[PDB]
């Protein structure tokens, strides 16, 4: 007979990242024994290369699939009410803007989706640049002519790295086991009679456990064979430095987002604004053999900034990010970004998660497919990974997250185009 929860060991691979750390957290909250939970990561939580290890992420509701609503409401409640998480949600509002007929029409539909989801009280439609300037007067009326916007009063931004770090502290305090670097870098599941009984890391260290979760984000499909259910892509950011005087003006600013332009955040406590552009992401295809592959594989393998910290971003990205600064913050259009880096996610075809047991390897569970939209689910997602581990995951969640190699083309996913490849977008490499 299988051990009871109190005696069930679980290895969480990628446990220094977003979904992994959440999974570890909820294992403990769910009454697994902390010392029976092992978090393994290539880098100490919060992992240097985790997409969650960031200054700032957007908190907001975005409804791409039906299951999105439930997950978003859970997340919102916890960012507002959970003592572990509350202090890292800055409820400054979210300004989701569009310009041009196509983008504006899509926004109008997005707005109505939010209403129909029951969020009318916390979302308003802004039908002119004047309405927009009321929620964010530091925008230039020159630059945002003909823009419209949804303002989500209930949105804002998340101090991402800090939130994960507080999860790490909690796990540490509770007695969770850690292995990092060589001791934490997953290479293979250990298998017996078609059952997963642990993992081996690059330094040869073996961990034995009743259950294994693979929450390795953009590395997941590089680590085990996922038949292109996930395709990993990079987005880009840079930082600009404000004087204390300049920063003070932008204090408590709503997040500003435009799908055709990018997005930026109020200054952190160091006077630093993070800016991203928006685009369909970049692959970096190469030859690589994930565990369980039965043929030569060309797949998108993250070019990790943590591994290659001299890397920057493509020249085209430097250009697009600068035009974003020019548009959003024209008075700053002449600042030089620094800390420019690529940040890695993995897209499924339908942009829903992949959270499911491996069809072959009993007790090995996938928890990835973040599809670039999942940091906000830090608080709650781990709970459902536990439900899946335990066989209690709701049918609608279970279906949406299921093993589905047949599902479609992740390279394009739900985005405007197939991702281009870093090989064809020069200027990021300085080896
Ligand atoms: C890139 C990006 C993503 C992003 C965003 C802006 C950018 C530039 N803006 C967002 C926003 O405003 N709001 C939001 O909700 N999400 C946003 N995203 C996406 C978000 O960052 C990601 O969807 C999410 O963080 C992904 O989480 P996940 O847990 O899937 O991935 P991770 O945090 O990267 O964790 C992966 C971990 O796995 C470890 N790893 C890798 N290889 C190994 C091996 N071999 N062994 C053990 N561990 C491994 C990594 O170290 C990492 O910690």
UniProtKB/TrEMBL annotation:
UniProt: FAD binding residues: 18-19, 41, 47, 49-52, 57-58, 186, 343, 370, 374-376
Taxonomy, superkingdom: Eukaryota
Record GO terms (molecular function): flavin adenine dinucleotide binding; saccharopine oxidase activity; sarcosine oxidase activity
All residue ranges annotated as the FAD dependent oxidoreductase domain in the record: 10-388
Cofactor(s) the protein requires to work: FAD
Sorted UniProt keywords: FAD, Flavoprotein, Nucleotide-binding, Oxidoreductase
Similarity comment: family membership: Belongs to the MSOX/MTOX family.
Entry protein name: FAD dependent oxidoreductase domain-containing protein
